[PDB]
Design a protein around this ligand. Structure first.
Ligand SMILES: Cc1cc2nc3c(=O)[nH]c(=O)nc-3n(C[C@H](O)[C@H](O)[C@H](O)COP(=O)(O)OP(=O)(O)OC[C@H]3O[C@@H](n4cnc5c(N)ncnc54)[C@H](O)[C@@H]3O)c2cc1C
Ligand SMILES: Cc1cc2nc3c(=O)[nH]c(=O)nc-3n(C[C@H](O)[C@H](O)[C@H](O)COP(=O)(O)OP(=O)(O)OC[C@H]3O[C@@H](n4cnc5c(N)ncnc54)[C@H](O)[C@@H]3O)c2cc1C
Lengths: 340, 340
């Protein structure tokens, strides 16, 4: 049973880990390899703050809400272990601000102590007249990716640095199952018109007195096109950029100024903070995540494919539920091949 | 009108400032000097984490409830100014954990979004079954003391490093009003058996993922004698030491281990944290703060004295209201001396 995972971000690596730990005992030769063009420092996953929070409006598919729930409950049970620091995982409380009232989110019972903001709290944010407060989790991609890598290494999983031209090429070399975790680039292996870049840009700043997150919202501009501030372990993320269709992997001055001005209005104490870095990434926007099987018909006998991509702006939020779902699908492949 | 302020802790400097800012225009020669033994890096105020939170049970003097409230609103309306970093002021949320049920505190409407810990939250803490959650402020003494200083310096307040043997000495040399802000050492100038040292021993640690304060309680052990973790700007404070009558200003190994063990139990990710430093200090314990006028019968005409000491383990929490009251008492002196 040769299994090739394409992609080394949160989705690929988490899926790879789930598959190994769940099926390495019920398969004699279980060889899992990971192919990726880019690894642990240079992925979209690295650009993410790693704040756990789904989109405001309900998901196109009600499964995602469970995958999110599952992810939260899992990371929560581990928040207080010694692993936590290596993971980059910790608790954080903060604000979601709006101009008008809005219905409570679906995940309001997932997070800790969800409530609405009080007048005193609102006075701290004059540009806004409504919002929430709650306690969530942060999984910093850069450390989490490092953890996964090392978990996988000790499990015999080999990593190879290469760009895959097609599924057929990988099947031609001997893969029985191909797990597709190519994020926003998935379309280069199989035309997917529903998958598009959600380009974002962020600023890492030194502001260690920030202990709360602050997400602003505005329908007039779109999800995550509003200033936000996310305290990390070493630095603070400043963001607020979302651009459908933009494939430019390049820091932009205009976006720089938008991040910087937005967040300063929001938190005046930021004016003297020192700028550590700046990065651009592409959210794999898709009306819903593609998490399904497909039999790639090719020659004598076809090869199995599990697609796992299109997690948009909530990959770290949902990755675990997805992995478990991918592993179940892997489960079914085995029983059909009558190997369980 | 010669005013001599004794003491350079948060109480001395804030009182000094609050008096100068309010009466320099209504008095032609208002020459204010600060006399102190120890200054801005080596005082009790420097050892304090700076968390705003009064004692758990109501104070035998209900003016204190107001003095703390006045302090909270003052710092809160300054949290988003460009001066916040300079003062060491910032918002922080966190947990108060208890074994049994306890009644809500008097200051429950002062803080932001005070509420009870939900079952899910309490599970993060196995050794506790009750508690609160809210949003407070931190005012780090070291920064604050430095800010107060530069403000006084530019107001023309002169500082002098010297140990004052008696009030008589200070009147004898020309003081018309003496402000007594000598903290726990007040008794060396005027006998007062109620004022006693509450020794503490904190530990500064590098754990930048900690975003919440965690305070544990136990009546079977005493106030601030139970483990607590308070995240600061550059480092995290670990404490839980309150010893009545102990005058030893020296770090104790047994206290170390107690701090270190109780905080690890409470937050296991602490195990691998780097220890930056450790310090001892003396809370000026008194059943209530002495903030009152007195006449010293020194020579032909008596000199005025404003006493402001005995702030216990809540001096930063209450400092501003005290300084306003002292200033008010300074005004009552003026009109009586026929100078208002
Ligand atoms: C600015 C920004 C902020 C974000 N903040 C958050 C947040 O706070 N919380 C949250 O949950 N999410 C956040 N996200 C979203 C999150 O970053 C993504 O949903 C997640 O990173 C996507 O993971 P992925 O593994 O699918 O893709 P990626 O992390 O991009 O990994 C894709 C992998 O596939 C490889 N690959 C692609 N094609 C090939 C090929 N042909 N051959 C070989 N390898 C290939 C790439 O090299 C890479 O290794 C943010 C995104 C951005 C841009
Ligand atoms: C471990 C610890 C943690 C704490 N944490 C907090 C907290 O989180 N929040 C909070 O609100 N409070 C906290 N406190 C309490 C706080 O530190 C004290 O309440 C406060 O600092 C007292 O201020 P002060 O100005 O009276 O005295 P100090 O800061 O001790 O200053 C006294 C001044 O008087 C001078 N002086 C005294 N006698 C003479 C003399 N004869 N001649 C000349 N000068 C003299 C001294 O040199 C010094 O300059 C904590 C205390 C400790 C020990």
């Amino acid at each position: 049973m040769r299994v090739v995972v394409i992609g080394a971000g949160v989705i690929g690596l988490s899926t790879a880990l789930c598959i190994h730990e769940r099926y390495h005992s019920v398969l004699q030769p279980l060889d899992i390899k990971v192919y990726a063009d880019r690894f642990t420092p240079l992925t979209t996953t690295d650009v993410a703050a790693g704040l756990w929070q789904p989109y405001l409006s309900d998901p196109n598919n009600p499964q995602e809400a469970d995958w999110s729930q599952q992810t939260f409950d899992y990371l929560l049970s581990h928040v207080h272990s010694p692993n936590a620091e290596n993971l980059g995982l910790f608790l954080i409380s903060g604000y979601n601000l709006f101009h008008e009232a809005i219905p409570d989110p679906s995940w309001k019972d997932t997070v800790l102590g969800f409530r609405k903001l009080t007048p005193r709290e609102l006075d701290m944010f004059p540009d806004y007249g409504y919002g929430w407060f709650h306690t969530s989790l942060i999984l910093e991609g850069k450390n989490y990716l490092q953890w996964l890598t090392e978990r996988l290494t000790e499990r015999g999983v080999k990593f190879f640095q290469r760009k895959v031209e097609s599924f057929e090429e990988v099947a031609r070399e001997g893969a029985d199952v191909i797990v597709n975790c190519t994020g926003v680039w998935a379309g280069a292996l199989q035309r997917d018109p529903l998958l598009q870049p959600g380009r974002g840009q962020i600023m890492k700043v030194d502001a260690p007195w920030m202990k709360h997150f602050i997400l602003t919202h505005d329908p007039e501009r779109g999800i995550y096109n509003s200033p936000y501030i996310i305290p990390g372990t070493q630095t603070v993320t400043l963001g607020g950029i979302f651009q459908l269709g933009n494939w430019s992997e390049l820091n932009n001055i205009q976006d720089h100024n938008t991040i910087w001005e937005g967040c300063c209005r929001l938190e005046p104490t930021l004016k003297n903070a020192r700028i550590i870095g700046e990065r651009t990434g592409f959210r794999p926007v898709r009306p819903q995540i593609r998490l399904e099987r497909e039999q790639l018909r090719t020659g004598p006998s076809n090869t199995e494919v599990i697609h796992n991509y299109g997690h948009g702006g909530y990959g770290l939020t949902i990755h675990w539920g997805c992995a478990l779902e991918a592993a179940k699908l892997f489960g079914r492949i085995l029983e059909e091949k009558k190997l369980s």
